[PDB]
Amino acid sequence: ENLYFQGDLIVSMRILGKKRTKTWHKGTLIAIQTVGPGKKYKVKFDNKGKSLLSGNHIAYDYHPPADKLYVGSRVVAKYKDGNQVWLYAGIVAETPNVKNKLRFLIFFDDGYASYVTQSELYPICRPLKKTWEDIEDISCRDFIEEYVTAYPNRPMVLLKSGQLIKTEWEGTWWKSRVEEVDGSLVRILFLDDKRCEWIYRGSTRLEPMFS
Ligand SMILES: COC(=O)c1cccc(NS(C)(=O)=O)c1
Ligand SMILES: [Cl-]
Ligand SMILES: [Cl-]
Ligand SMILES: [Cl-]
Numbered sequence: 001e002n003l004y005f006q007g008d009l010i011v012s013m014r015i016l017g018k019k020r021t022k023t024w025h026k027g028t029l030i031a032i033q034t035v036g037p038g039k040k041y042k043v044k045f046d047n048k049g050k051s052l053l054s055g056n057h058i059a060y061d062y063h064p065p066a067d068k069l070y071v072g073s074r075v076v077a078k079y080k081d082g083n084q085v086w087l088y089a090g091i092v093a094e095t096p097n098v099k100n101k102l103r104f105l106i107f108f109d110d111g112y113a114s115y116v117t118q119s120e121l122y123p124i125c126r127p128l129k130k131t132w133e134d135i136e137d138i139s140c141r142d143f144i145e146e147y148v149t150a151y152p153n154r155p156m157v158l159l160k161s162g163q164l165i166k167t168e169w170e171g172t173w174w175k176s177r178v179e180e181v182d183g184s185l186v187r188i189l190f191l192d193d194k195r196c197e198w199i200y201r202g203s204t205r206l207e208p209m210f211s
């Protein structure tokens with residue numbers, strides 16, 4: 001059947017939609033379709049064509065109030081790639097508190113992690129019951145499931161600036177150094193390539209956590 005209303009969604013509302021590039025963009029909800037128990041949402045993008053999307057691939061174009069977000073909530077957040085900025089999907093790993101200077105910790109679908117403000121988050125409309133089950137990468141999905149279900153029990157390695165450790169990249173161990181610590185994240189310098197990365201202190205990519 002063709003619907004005009006579905007929960008709090010209404011045909012003609014302005015919305016964010018996931019494109020095939022895995023980045024999220026502004027559009028208009030032009031139709032809602034049902035086929036038995038399933039539902040699909042037709043979006044017309046501003047500078048693109050149309051897509052018929054599932055409910056976990058559309059997001060509201062407003063920032064959620066803090067009482068609606070939990071550890072494990074499915075969101076779209078501002079993602080830094082070189083000097084460009086995109087909207088990319090992720091999972092909330094921490095909500096605002098004193099030890100993280102009132103920010104949200106995001107674990108992105110591709111394995112990266114970052115702290116963001118409430119004004120840099122958008123909630124996904126119809127998340128799955130087990131929110132992590134639509135993460136394509138198997139190693140990311142299994143780590144996030146264990147993290148969300150075990151929370152607040154969070155094993156992490158205590159690290160200080162200048163400390164030498166081994167860090168994983170493309171299947172092998174690399175000599176590396178701790179440059180900086182910011183709450184639950186650590187900035188690691190890869191010594192041969194002389195380039196840095198922000199990594200979660202409980203990640204198995206850090207050798208002390210792997211063992
Ligand atoms: C490709 O990413 C992975 O395999 C992977 C595995 C484990 C952890 C992570 N990152 S996180 C959730 O610790 O910020 C990524
Ligand atoms: Cl295809
Ligand atoms: Cl039907
Ligand atoms: Cl879809």
Ligand SMILES: [Cl-]
Binds near residue numbers: 127128129
């Ligand atoms: Cl579900």
